């Protein structure tokens, strides 16, 4: 047992989403467990700073979160929206190999775009905002894996995009911005 | 391994939905797996008397389901909608104590019965009514996870919220009401 | 440690939609991991045929994967559409059983033919077509599990239908036809 990498279930602020900040605006609670050949993700992302929370004044929403992993599953923070790496939930060590959790290469695999659609690599879904009047919006979702390498330092790749295209604003005032979780499964690694 | 909790895969009525009955009047199949930090959940209702039948006769519905928990797992039959508690699909000394299989007050507190605050209680998704003509309707889930304690002898809460929104009743008959199967994840207590 | 049935995460053609065709023409990955009292499933079709890569030049659209498995879980080629039978993911024999990843006969019975609806039998979701263009096209998607049987050597059916219903064609030439991935769950059988 180390079947669940994840970043607690009520992180502190821990990822950014404004481009260009230096630190943390909102807080990703992301949880990978094994299952056999695949992992069990849950996802859901809390704002923190008063940009993200009033994104959804505005009736188009894109909101984007990129993770780059080294050869054993760790974080790289410098690249990385999140900004500090996962860890075990069992085990006090920092000292483990996190591969067995990461996206296959076989299944989702990088590629060099050479004229020739490549989407294999995408999941889609949805997930919801519950605004402060109580209307409830559909976000789209959108997880990558793998398909694009951007350095030499990067072994996998999982990015996200949250998109709300609305006929109206959800909010008119600032609220704290929560997406609904979002569960997704995918074709894991070897350990 | 202990790690299945259940009402069964078949459940004769053990529900009920209509306010102010005193017997079942729907089948609730409800089926709680752990997974490493996780559990994963299973949710189907099927109704079983002419009131539940025959709601599907409206173009608005609105069906609740609430589970209360004692501090070991176990449903608190009086206070819920579910009139028998759930078991494990393997048998009891002392039948068990179920803790590991609630959801957890650390990710999903308990907070002040303000209205319209603590939206991270909530998981959002859609299931669906196949009609007696073949036509399919969504049906918008709602699970509340803690949130709010029904009474002073409760430690954990589970309720879910099928509605349904449409240009045209479904039914102009009574027909057996049929929750497709939806499935949803959350992060569990400790055992 | 032998829960996890599959395809394999990047199979050669293996499965045949078009009507009356002898060889595959499309490679079907379905993954069927056992946790608890539940399979969790994930499936995608991959088109492999000019005919399967040009359905998406219609608006409306059925692809139908039939699979029909005997009474120890293994594929009935004949008659299924996927012509290879499932592997574990750490074998190598037919000195496996597979009824424990199979739908249960007790929540998903088989029915007398032809009498009535049985829409407990049916799951129904979402999944996705991201056309050339780069447009996403949402797929409804049916899975039933028993009911019916094709003859008298089979044992369980799962079957599979992704249908499209758009107000345009997503593409006007061919192009590689790829549904996203689905995951589902569902009561299993007994081991």
Redesign the interface.
């Known amino acids: 047992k180390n079947?669940?990498l994840?970043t607690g279930?009520?992180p502190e602020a821990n990822c950014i989403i404004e481009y260009g900040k230096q630190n943390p605006d909102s807080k990703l609670?992301l949880?990978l467990?094994?299952?056999?050949?695949?992992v069990?993700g849950?996802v859901?992302l809390?704002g923190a700073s008063d940009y993200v929370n009033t994104l959804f004044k505005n009736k188009n929403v894109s909101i984007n979160v990129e993770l780059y992993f080294d050869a054993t599953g760790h974080i790289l923070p410098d690249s990385s929206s999140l900004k500090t790496d996962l860890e075990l939930?069992y085990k006090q060590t920092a000292d483990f190999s996190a591969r067995g959790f990461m996206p296959?290469t076989?299944?989702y695999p990088f590629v060099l775009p050479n004229a020739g659609?490549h989407?294999?690599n995408?999941?889609?879904g949805?997930?919801?905002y519950?605004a402060?009047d109580?209307a409830?919006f559909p976000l789209?979702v959108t997880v990558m894996l793998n398909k694009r390498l951007p350095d030499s330092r990067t072994s996998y790749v999982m990015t996200f995009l949250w998109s709300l295209n609305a006929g109206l604003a959800p909010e008119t005032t600032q609220a704290?911005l929560?997406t609904?979780?979002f569960?997704?499964?995918?074709?894991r690694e070897d350990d």
Chains 1, 2, 3 share one sequence.
């Open positions: 079947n669940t994840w279930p009520k609670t949880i467990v094994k299952n056999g050949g695949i069990n849950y859901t809390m939930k296959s076989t299944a659609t989407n294999e995408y999941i889609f949805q997930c919801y519950k402060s109580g409830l789209e704290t929560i609904s979780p569960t997704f499964s995918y074709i």
